[PDB]
Every structure is written in C-alpha cells, then in structure tokens.
Amino acid sequence: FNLDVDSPAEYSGPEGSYFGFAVDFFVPSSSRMFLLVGAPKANTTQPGIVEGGQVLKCDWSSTRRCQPIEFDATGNRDYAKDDPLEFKSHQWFGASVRSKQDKILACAPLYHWRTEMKQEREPVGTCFLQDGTKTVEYAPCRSQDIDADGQGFCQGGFSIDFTKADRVLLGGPGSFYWQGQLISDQVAEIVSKYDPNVYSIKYNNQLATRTAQAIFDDSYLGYSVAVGDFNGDGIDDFVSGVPRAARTLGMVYIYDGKNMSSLYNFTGEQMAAYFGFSVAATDINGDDYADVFIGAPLFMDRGSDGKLQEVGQVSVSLQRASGDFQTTKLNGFEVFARFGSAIAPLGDLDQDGFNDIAIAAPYGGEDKKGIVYIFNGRSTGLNAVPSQILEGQWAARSGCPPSFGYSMKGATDIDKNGYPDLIVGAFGVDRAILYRARPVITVNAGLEVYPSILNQDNKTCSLPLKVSCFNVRFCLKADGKGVLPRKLNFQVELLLDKLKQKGAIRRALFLYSRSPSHSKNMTISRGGLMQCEELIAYLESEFRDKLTPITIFMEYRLDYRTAADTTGLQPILNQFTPANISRQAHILLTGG
Amino acid sequence: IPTENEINTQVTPGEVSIQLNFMLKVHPLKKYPVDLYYLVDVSASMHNNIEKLNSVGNDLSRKMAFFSRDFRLGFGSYVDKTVSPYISIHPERNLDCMPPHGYIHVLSLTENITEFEKAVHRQKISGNIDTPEGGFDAMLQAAVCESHIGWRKEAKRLLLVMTDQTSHLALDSKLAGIVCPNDGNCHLKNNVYVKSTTMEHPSLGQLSEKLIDNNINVIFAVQGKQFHWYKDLLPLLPGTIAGEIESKAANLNNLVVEAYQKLISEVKVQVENGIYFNITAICPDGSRKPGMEGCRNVTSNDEVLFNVTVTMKKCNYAIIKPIGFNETAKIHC
Ligand SMILES: *[C@@H]1O[C@H](CO)[C@@H](O[C@@H]2O[C@H](CO)[C@@H](O[C@@H]3O[C@H](CO[C@H]4O[C@H](CO)[C@@H](O)[C@H](O[C@H]5O[C@H](CO)[C@@H](O)[C@H](O)[C@@H]5O)[C@@H]4O)[C@@H](O)[C@H](O[C@H]4O[C@H](CO)[C@@H](O)[C@H](O)[C@@H]4O)[C@@H]3O)[C@H](O)[C@H]2NC(C)=O)[C@H](O)[C@H]1NC(C)=O
Ligand SMILES: *[C@@H]1O[C@H](CO)[C@@H](O[C@@H]2O[C@H](CO)[C@@H](O[C@@H]3O[C@H](CO[C@H]4O[C@H](CO)[C@@H](O)[C@H](O)[C@@H]4O)[C@@H](O)[C@H](O[C@H]4O[C@H](CO)[C@@H](O)[C@H](O)[C@@H]4O)[C@@H]3O)[C@H](O)[C@H]2NC(C)=O)[C@H](O)[C@H]1NC(C)=O
Ligand SMILES: *[C@@H]1O[C@H](CO)[C@@H](O[C@@H]2O[C@H](CO)[C@@H](O[C@@H]3O[C@H](CO)[C@@H](O)[C@H](O[C@H]4O[C@H](CO)[C@@H](O)[C@H](O)[C@@H]4O)[C@@H]3O)[C@H](O)[C@H]2NC(C)=O)[C@H](O)[C@H]1NC(C)=O
Ligand SMILES: *[C@@H]1O[C@H](CO)[C@@H](O[C@@H]2O[C@H](CO)[C@@H](O[C@@H]3O[C@H](CO)[C@@H](O)[C@H](O[C@H]4O[C@H](CO)[C@@H](O)[C@H](O)[C@@H]4O)[C@@H]3O)[C@H](O)[C@H]2NC(C)=O)[C@H](O)[C@H]1NC(C)=O
Ligand SMILES: *[C@@H]1O[C@H](CO)[C@@H](O[C@@H]2O[C@H](CO)[C@@H](O[C@@H]3O[C@H](CO)[C@@H](O)[C@H](O[C@H]4O[C@H](CO)[C@@H](O)[C@H](O)[C@@H]4O)[C@@H]3O)[C@H](O)[C@H]2NC(C)=O)[C@H](O)[C@H]1NC(C)=O
Ligand SMILES: *[C@@H]1O[C@H](CO)[C@@H](O[C@@H]2O[C@H](CO)[C@@H](O)[C@H](O)[C@H]2NC(C)=O)[C@H](O)[C@H]1NC(C)=O
Ligand SMILES: *[C@@H]1O[C@H](CO)[C@@H](O[C@@H]2O[C@H](CO)[C@@H](O)[C@H](O)[C@H]2NC(C)=O)[C@H](O)[C@H]1NC(C)=O
Ligand SMILES: *[C@@H]1O[C@H](CO)[C@@H](O)[C@H](O)[C@H]1NC(C)=O
Ligand SMILES: *[C@@H]1O[C@H](CO)[C@@H](O)[C@H](O)[C@H]1NC(C)=O
Ligand SMILES: [Ca+2]
Ligand SMILES: [Ca+2]
Ligand SMILES: [Ca+2]
Ligand SMILES: [Ca+2]
Ligand SMILES: [Ca+2]
Ligand SMILES: [Mg+2]
C-alpha cells in the first residue's frame, strides 16, 4: 500500500526492442545501485547480426540514462570457411537476467549453433556471465548430445536464478523431446573452466536432470525456476514449473539443491491452465520457512452463473516443519487478464514484519494496460485482499499489448530508505518503471472527555455570563521504521456533536472559539510519547432535543509536503489505522 | 413477467423484461441444415488417415442428407506455427512432403460434394519437430472467419478437427519468442493464417468464447491414446464432443454421425453476464438437474424448458444461450 505511484522513475528503450521483457537490480558488493533491463529484440553493433538483443544498465540517480552492457561484441564464429558455427541473429539475448552482487548473468534462449558433426541450426541456448572484470560464456546445453533426442533444442537460459551459495540454476525446457532439463553449476567453475576454444565445456561439480521415459515428453520442465530451502539443510533447493506435465495439467518439481534428488511434486488441477508458468519462493508468514507460489495464468473459474471465466489463479503453499504444505488458492479478478503471469517477492514492503508479494495481470485494466496487485503477508499466511493496485499508463503502441507487469523484480532498497522497492516491465511499449516504497508511519491518537456526563444546571465556567462546561483533550504520538523526518506535522480537526447534521441544530461549542470546530497544526516529535492538548467546551433554551448523544469527533492528517525527503518521497500512514476517533458525552436528565 | 410479441425464436420467450421465477422453452427442430467443416492436421503421422478419407465423405453425404434437409461441406488443413523450435529452419530439410504451415482454408462449404473429394486427394502432407500440433489457431480461425468459410446462420455449424496428438497451448508460444496473446479475429488474407508467427495460440477461454459466440459445435476426431486428452477437455468447452478414430480407421462417417445425433440429443444452457440465476431442468423424463448440465437423449420433438430464479442483491441486459443453437432469449428499488 506504500508504493509511490505519483512520481515513479520511468525508463525507456529502443522502439521494438521489447525493452522491459526482463528486469532486475544490480547491487555490487557498499556501492551505487542500478537497474537492469533486457531488450531481447534490440539491434546490436556486433557485425552481421539482426536483433541480437542486449541488456541495459540504467542509472539510479540524476538522469535515467540506460547504457547497454557489452557481454560480447563479436559476430557469429565460424567453425569452417563459409561454415558458420552459431547464429546470434534473433537469439533473444537479455530475455533472462539475474544479478548477484558483482555477478550478472544474461541468456539468449533462441541462440542457435550448427553442431560439430553436421550442418544444422539447433536452439541450445546460451548465456554470458560477468563478474568484476571477467566475462565468460555458459552454454551447458550445447554439447555432444545433439538434436531433439538430447540437448539440441534445450534453449538453455529460458529461465535462470542464483542460489545463496553462488551457484547458477538454469532451465532448459526443450531437452529430451521437450521433457525439459535443469542444470546447476558453481559460478567459480563456470569462471575457471571457461575456454574460448572449447564449445562444449565440462564442469566438474555440475548437477543436471537425467533424460527420462517418453511419457514425460513435451512437459517443458525448466519453463520457470526459483530457489529456496525445502528440507531444512541450509542449501537452497531448486524449484521449477512443468506447465505441460501430467497431461497438460501442469506440475512443479522441487529438487534437492545438494544432489538434484527429487523432493516434492505439486500437481495442477485444471487442464491447460498452464499450472507452472511462473514460480516464486519466499517466507510469506514470517515462519522462517520458504513458501511456494505457483502461477496458472490461463485458469478458468466457475462462479455463480456456471460460466467459466478465464481469470488465472495462484496457489500459495506454506511450508510446515512436518514437510508437507498448507495450500490455499487465489483466483484472478478480471477475465483474460492472465492474473499470475508474473510473481515477484517484494520483501517486507511495509516493513511490518512479514514479507509481501506482487502478482501481475499483464493484460488487465482499462484498455489492457496491465495491472500489478500487491499482497501483504501475515502470521496466518497471505492476506488475500490486495493492499495496492498498480496500473500501466500506456496504450498499445503496436501489435503487442503493453504487458505492464509481465516482468518485475523487487526486494531491493535502491534509495536506501529502509524499504524494498519494485521494478515493473512493460515490453509491449518498451518501458520499465521503478516504484519506490514510501515510509510507513504508525500513529496513536487519544481522546478524553471529562466530565463525560454533563449537568445543564452546573454552570461552572464563565464565558468571556456562565454556562455548563467540560474538557476535551486530544493526544497524539507517531513513529515508524526506516528513514523519516524527526518532526512530523499533523493537522487535527475537531468537531462537536456530529450526529446532528449541518441542516440540524448543534448544542456543544467551544469556549474561546464560540464555534463547534477546532483546527490545529501540531508538530510532534517522532518516536516520543503523546503530545496532548486540552481545551474547554460549553453547551437549553436554544434546543429541545437532548435524547441524542453528543459525539466529539477528531480526525488527523499529516503534512506530506513538509515530511518528504530530498527525493520527494512523502511518508504514508499505516493502512489499517483509523484516520479518526471519537468520544461521547450526555446530559443528566431530571434524575436526582 | 412480460413476454414479447411475434415470437420468431426457437427458445420461448425470445425477449423478457423483469425488474426486481419464470420458465423458458427451448425446443430443437427435427430437420436441421448442416455445415460440416473438416479441419485436419496434415502432419506426417496422418499419412494413413488422409489417404483413407479420399472418397468417404461422398458416402457420408448420403446419411447426412437423410439426417438434414440441406448439407454443405468444407475443408481446411493445418500443421504448426512455421517458426523455430516448432519446425526445422534449415534452408533445406523424407518422402514427398509439402512445406509446413499454420492453417489454410482450402474449400468453403458447398453442396457439390465431388469438389470435396477433388480437394482432399489434392492435399499433401508436411512435417515438423514437436509432437503436439497447433490446432487451436486453426479452430479459432475457422470459427471467427464466418464469411470466408461460409457458415450459414441457420445450419448446425459442426467443426470436425481431425488429429492424433495433443494440440499446442497459448503459452507454449513463448518458447518461440511469440508472447503477444491471440486477438481472436480473422487473419486470412489469401486463405492463409498470416499471423501464425506473430500471435500466441488461443487459450481455451478465448476459444470457448469464440465458439459459443459463432455457435460452433466441435467434434474431436483423434486416433492415439490422446483421445482421452481431448476427452478430459470436453468439460471446459461446452457444446463439444470427442470421437476416437479406431486404429484401422474408416469409422469417420459413423463417428461424426454418432456425434451429430448426440448434440440433437442434448440441449444445454449457458448465461453470459450484478445478479444470480438458478436453473432447474425439465427433461422429457422426470429429471431435475442444474442448467449448466442440460438434459440428454432429448427427442427432437419433445419440448424442454428451464426454470430461472432471479435474485438481485445490489440496487443492463443478460443473455441465456442454449449451446449449439443460434436463437436466444435476451432478458432486460
Ligand atoms: C515427481 O514426479 C516425477 C515425474 O512425474 C517423478 O520422476 C519420475 O520418477 C520415476 C520413478 O522414480 C522415474 O521412472 C524411473 O525410471 C527408471 C528407468 O531409468 C531410466 O534410465 C536408464 C538409463 O537410461 C534406462 O536404462 C531406463 O530404461 C527405460 O527403458 C526401458 C525400455 O528399453 C524400460 O524397460 C525401463 O523400465 C526404462 O523405462 C530408463 O530410461 C526406472 O528404473 C525406475 O523404476 C524403478 O522402480 C521400478 C519398479 O517399477 C524398477 O523396475 C526399476 O529397476 C527402478 O528400481 C523408475 O520407473 C521417472 O524417470 C521420473 N521422471 C522424471 C521426469 O523425473 C518423481 O519421482 C516424483 N517425485 C515425487 C516426490 O513425487
Ligand atoms: C533491427 O534492424 C533490422 C534491419 O537490420 C530491422 O529489420 C527490418 O525491419 C523492417 C521493419 O521496419 C522490415 O521492413 C519490412 O520488410 C518486409 C520484407 O522483408 C523481407 O524481405 C527481406 C529481403 O528483401 C528479408 O531480409 C526479410 O527477412 C524479409 O523476409 C516488407 O515486406 C515489409 O513491408 C511492409 O511494411 C512496410 C512498412 O515498413 C509497409 O510500407 C509495406 O506496405 C508492408 O506492409 C517491411 O517493409 C525489414 O524487412 C527488416 N529487415 C530485415 C533484414 O530483417 C529490425 O526491424 C530492427 N529492429 C529494431 C528493434 O530496431
Ligand atoms: C541425495 O541426497 C539425499 C539426502 O540428502 C538422498 O535421499 C536419502 O537417501 C538415503 C540413502 O542414503 C535414504 O536413506 C535410506 O532410507 C531407507 C528408507 O527410508 C532406509 O531403509 C535406509 O536404511 C539403510 O540404509 C542406510 C544407508 O546409510 C544404512 O546406513 C542403514 O543401516 C540401513 O541399512 C536408508 O537410511 C533416505 O531415505 C533419502 N531421503 C532422505 C530424506 O534422507 C538421495 O538419495 C540422494 N540422491 C542421490 C545421491 O542421487
Ligand atoms: C461542574 O463541572 C465542573 C467542571 O466543569 C466539575 O468540577 C470537577 O470536579 C472534579 C472533582 O469532583 C474534578 O476531578 C478531577 O479533574 C481533573 C481535571 O483537571 C481530572 O484530570 C481528574 O481525573 C484525573 O485523575 C483520575 C484519577 O482519579 C484519572 O482516573 C483520570 O483519568 C484523570 O487523569 C478528576 O476528574 C474535575 O477536574 C472538575 N472539572 C474540571 C473541568 O476540572 C464539577 O464537579 C461539576 N459539578 C458537580 C456538581 O460535580
Ligand atoms: C437460426 O436458424 C434457424 C434455422 O432453423 C433460422 O430459421 C430458418 O431460416 C431458414 C432460412 O433459409 C428457413 O429456411 C427456409 O424455409 C422455407 C420453407 O421451409 C424454404 O422455402 C426456404 O427456401 C430457401 O432455400 C431454397 C433452397 O434450399 C432457396 O432456393 C430459397 O431461395 C430459400 O433460400 C428456406 O429453406 C427455415 O424455414 C427457418 N426455420 C425456422 C424454424 O425459422 C433462423 O432464422 C436463424 N436465426 C437467425 C437470427 O437468423
Ligand atoms: C461440381 O464439381 C465438379 C468438380 O469440378 C464439376 O465438374 C467440373 O465441370 C467442369 C465443367 O463445368 C469441368 O471443366 C471440370 O473438369 C469438372 N471437374 C471434374 C473434377 O470433373 C461440376 O461441374 C460441379 N457441378 C456444379 C453444378 O457446379
Ligand atoms: C439415455 O442416456 C443414458 C445416459 O444419459 C444412456 O446410457 C448410456 O448408454 C450408452 C450406450 O447407449 C453407454 O455407453 C453409457 O455408458 C450409458 N450411460 C449411462 C449413464 O447409462 C442411454 O443409452 C440413453 N438412451 C438411448 C436410447 O440412447
Ligand atoms: C442455486 O440453488 C441451489 C439450491 O438448489 C443453491 O445451493 C445455490 O447456492 C444457488 N446458487 C446461487 C448462485 O444462488
Ligand atoms: C472516520 O473513519 C471511518 C473509518 O475508520 C470512516 O468510515 C468514516 O467515514 C470517517 N469519518 C469521517 C467524518 O471522515
Ligand atoms: Ca535444501
Ligand atoms: Ca512460511
Ligand atoms: Ca510486509
Ligand atoms: Ca526503498
Ligand atoms: Ca508440432
Ligand atoms: Mg503430427
């Protein structure tokens, strides 16, 4: 709920380059931070290559300049005279990007090579890894096991990720007649074992899935990947979606990160819903147990009228110490919006103590501009009601819809205000947007009325004649996590006896003001105890109705403009905190 | 409450205006004009099936003309999207094959049947790599391209898709770099799906919507084990049925007629678009089922109505379609 939407940082790339198809944060090990954006169809300087694609590094401060990252300036290598070895044209480089401190890994899943035995064009896929200075190539699917029977069409790099222990996890959905394949290699070995003259490099401590029976053909293992511990060993385990497995019913395999031994299987529920298009792993209930989020963008729900409505669905499986999962589902909202296309952990967005998450509907909203919903984690799991809705601000430039939300990455505090932020890509319009998290303020308000029971014949106070009177006292304190100003300015507006509308008479007014209203600018220090202020208010010949109670209502609103920082990011108030409170008073009736 | 005049709809009443329990009478006619469109996968595995159907449609027209007053027949072929990794993109690439292709509408519905025979034998076979075949794009195109294929607004519009393996899905396209969802509109310039390499396959939701809107009843004629695949998808596409082409084949005519008499033997209702509706069944025999599950075995003569209970909670017009039919009932603190 605390994402700045009035002034997010907007970045753009070359028209038609699909700028924003994949986004990520680049945070070197006490150094400036940058955005990373993939442009898979971008033309390049490397000679004789059309739409080779690239990966842009976008500055954080000052101008929003995006400069490409030079992973490889060379054209297609020849294996023999007029016998090209590879085909980088339309290889879709930058379609998959992941960063980890000094390491940046990009991949071209439509890269082709001829093979060393015959003249073919097989999409083995390739990647380029860059640390501090070195820049190596990583093609674990271009090998001797060629053609569809092996890794010929593996498209290695279709999806990637890092593990906590600097280990690359790569998915190749086309291995072994599209049974898919997962490959895990230590970064140190991808670096050390690199050789410019060997095209099928062998890595010692490699982990990879083994070809299986034909029943598993056309299952697309590795379509999407994610990492997280799911056996209590500390080693990040591998998670991958298999959207065509189980007779196009979809599945999600979880393998041990230590030796690629099968750990768990999730199975879809509806055929062709593409259960397993997107996958994410994060502890959403603060139990320190990684939870699994699985997307099915094509899911159809049957509501009241029986009509099936394609709205998509996301399964939230909370891990328990026992081993199994407590699974709860979450349908979309708009038809054909493909809710669940992208799933991005955000960290503790509101810094409430439970991680949060964003789920995309890239083809929803007015004119299919695309939407991103935000959900907050709770002790009980995920709050199924989204606390924020982000909408694209561009229309169909050409053919492909904006696709705002198709890609997005969070959980990084780029401005260093104590809260993670979010990047959202919209490749159909060649844009990427950085939404920054506003610091959350928690406010405690107090209101006391003494005496609560009024006495019309009391007449203690002396109006500047005498009238019966009482005291109205409002207190206020506030504090919050992260970076915020030391003095917070709230304006409090008090009104007396609201239940009687303006058209009707009022009975309780203030002494010094002679008015029912009272406004006050109040500068309270942040994190201190309650600053309080009380004032006197007085009250038969002017009204007959005494049976209706007297409500004393107070609302408070902080001054955003003065509380903003130098970058302009204004603080925000906690989402579940009433902006107003009230007390009551009554008159003694006859009695005795 | 109020019933419109001059009827002229097969579902009675044809238009209603209620402002907040009534019964609507659907009744299928016996002799229905029929529009049969053979959409066939022409991949390698189908060489036997194509050869078989060279002169079998000529026979079926006998039974069908006996079943239906009018009868017309059209034909179209499909394979897969002509882009890697679905096909081999070597400038060459073993027996007599034609180049791959998304979808070609070759013959519009016509009564002259020998034209269909001449068109099918003239058909040749292609080939690709991945086992599943992009059939759903062809289905959508044959559905929405009403004028090109020539679907009559009166005839029962049957689309017979003939294959042997599973069909491709929309998100499958992402592998090829095709990430622009299907737009669901006709894109045939010279009877060729020009958008085969630019848009994803249509999702089942889009396809169901386009079939229901164009009132197309699909018949999945398949051979291999994947029959069960197309069978388990039936609940997701109403007004659709599947038939297994048994090993030896040649049951094509008998299969499609067994499938035809099964939709005349079923009248199911589906409402589109804040208000809840509750439905009960009134079959010839005493049966009481929810509207989504329409009676079966329904004899063409017997009347069949449904109860509707309308209960609005918050203080437009809705449409109640009996699937497979072309005429409908519009209904308007
Ligand atoms: C989650 O879900 C996934 C998939 O849904 C599960 O992963 C699958 O698990 C099953 C069971 O463990 C795997 O099947 C196994 O297959 C082996 C065969 O080994 C293969 O490799 C050998 C090397 O090439 C090869 O020799 C084998 O030969 C095949 O072909 C011949 C015909 O020529 C045939 O006769 C063979 O049987 C093989 O099919 C083969 O290619 C097999 O050995 C395993 O069987 C064990 O148990 C059987 C008893 O039924 C016994 O006979 C065997 O000796 C062996 O002890 C087993 O069937 C499958 O490959 C996995 N697929 C994938 C994609 O991973 C996963 O287990 C699930 N996990 C959880 C937690 O639910
Ligand atoms: C990166 O840079 C490359 C070039 O280096 C660009 O590729 C060109 O993109 C333009 C689009 O603006 C293409 O223009 C179109 O060409 C079609 C014919 O191309 C075919 O034939 C050539 C050989 O003659 C082949 O090389 C090619 O692969 C094709 O097989 C025309 O038929 C098109 O006509 C239609 O569009 C025009 C508008 O441009 C209309 O006026 C016409 O009426 C008609 O509707 C069109 O002209 C061009 O062919 C592409 N060249 C190549 C070599 O691919 C990328 O677009 C660029 N990408 C980015 C992101 O910058
Ligand atoms: C990858 O590593 C995982 C573990 O990190 C491994 O899974 C485990 O494998 C071991 C085998 O070493 C399994 O342990 C066996 O379980 C069976 C049934 O529960 C027992 O009957 C066995 O008991 C005998 O074997 C022991 C072997 O040490 C003997 O010491 C003992 O005296 C018995 O004779 C045995 O304990 C274990 O169940 C799994 N799973 C788990 C959660 O531990 C996986 O096999 C590895 N895959 C590789 C290396 O490919
Ligand atoms: C006619 O009205 C007048 C006032 O308009 C009223 O005089 C009241 O007398 C009582 C004594 O009987 C006073 O009592 C205290 O007043 C202070 C306010 O200065 C309060 O803060 C006191 O409560 C505090 O302490 C309590 C501990 O016992 C806490 O529980 C509480 O939360 C407070 O912290 C206590 O109420 C009273 O102050 C005055 N009125 C005013 C406005 O000061 C008079 O009694 C009325 N007529 C009759 C016949 O009673
Ligand atoms: C929904 O579909 C129904 C179909 O049941 C449709 O109502 C039907 O329309 C057709 C339109 O042709 C009617 O068919 C006509 O019937 C009369 C008498 O039987 C014939 O004389 C007509 O002759 C035509 O056909 C000849 C050759 O076949 C031509 O030479 C001649 O010129 C005519 O074209 C014609 O066959 C049919 O009677 C009606 N049936 C009913 C029950 O209304 C309805 O209109 C469709 N809905 C919408 C909104 O269009
Ligand atoms: C029905 O289709 C057949 C098939 O083409 C038509 O027969 C053709 O007739 C023309 C003369 O008009 C000949 O030139 C062709 O060679 C014939 N084709 C074949 C395959 O024999 C027939 O004329 C059509 N009938 C009608 C009424 O249009
Ligand atoms: C009336 O419908 C019932 C089912 O609704 C039919 O019973 C089926 O009969 C077929 C063969 O005719 C079997 O393959 C099915 O397994 C049967 N299903 C059930 C549930 O009984 C019955 O045949 C129909 N009547 C007629 C005359 O066709
Ligand atoms: C329809 O009626 C049934 C009872 O036959 C009830 O269970 C169901 O909730 C109702 N549906 C709606 C949308 O009110
Ligand atoms: C006071 O806050 C409540 C929610 O806590 C809200 O429903 C109500 O409208 C507010 N009153 C005014 C006067 O704004
Ligand atoms: Ca682990
Ligand atoms: Ca957890
Ligand atoms: Ca949180
Ligand atoms: Ca931040
Ligand atoms: Ca295919
Ligand atoms: Mg085939």
Numbering used by the authors:
A (entry chain A): 1 to 29, 31 to 465, 469 to 543, 546 to 598
B (entry chain B): 66 to 85, 92 to 164, 173 to 352, 356 to 397, 404 to 420, 425
Q: What did the publication describing this PDB structure actually write?
A:
Integrins comprise a family of αβ heterodimers with diverse functions in cell adhesion, migration, and signaling. However, two integrins, αVβ6 and αVβ8, appear to have evolved primarily to activate transforming growth factor-β1 (TGF-β1) and TGF-β3 and bind with high affinity to a RGDLXX(L/I) motif in the TGF-β prodomain. In contrast, the β8-subunit of integrin αVβ8 has a divergent cytoplasmic domain that binds to the Band 4.1 family. Furthermore, in contrast to other integrins, binding of ligand to αVβ8 fails to induce swing-out of the hybrid domain; that is, the open headpiece conformation.
An integrin αVβ8 headpiece fragment with high mannose N-glycans was expressed in GnTI-deficient HEK293 cells, purified, crystallized, and soaked with or without the TGF-β1 ligand peptide G213RRGDLATIHG223. The β-propeller and thigh domains in αV and the βI and hybrid domains in β8 are resolved in the structure. In unliganded αVβ8, nine residues in the SDL2 loop, including one of the disulfide-bonded Cys residues, are disordered. The β8 βI domain has unique features compared to previously structurally characterized integrin β-subunits, all of which link to the actin cytoskeleton through talin and kindlin, that is, β1, β2, β3, β6, and β711,17–19. The most striking difference is the lack of an ADMIDAS Ca2+ ion. In contrast, β8 has Asn-119 and Asn-120 (N8 and N9) in place of the D8 and D9 Asp residues. However, replacement of β-MIDAS motif D8 and D9 residues with Asn in β8 results in the absence of any negatively charged sidechains to coordinate Ca2+ and is likely to be sufficient to explain the lack of an ADMIDAS metal ion in αVβ8. The β8 βI domain not only lacks an ADMIDAS but also displays differences from all previously structurally characterized integrin βI domains in the α1 and α1′ helices and the β6-α7 loop. β8 is exceptional for lacking electron density for residues between the βI domain α1 and α1′ helices in one of four different unliganded molecules and one of two different liganded molecules in crystal asymmetric units. Disorder at this position has not been seen in any of a large number of previous integrin crystal structures and appears to be related to an unusual conformation of the β8 βI domain β6-α7 loop that makes it unengaged with the α1 and α1′ helices, as discussed in the next paragraph. β8 differs from typical integrins in lacking an (Asp/Asn)-Ser motif in the β6-α7 loop, which enforces a stereotypical loop conformation in all previously crystallized integrins.
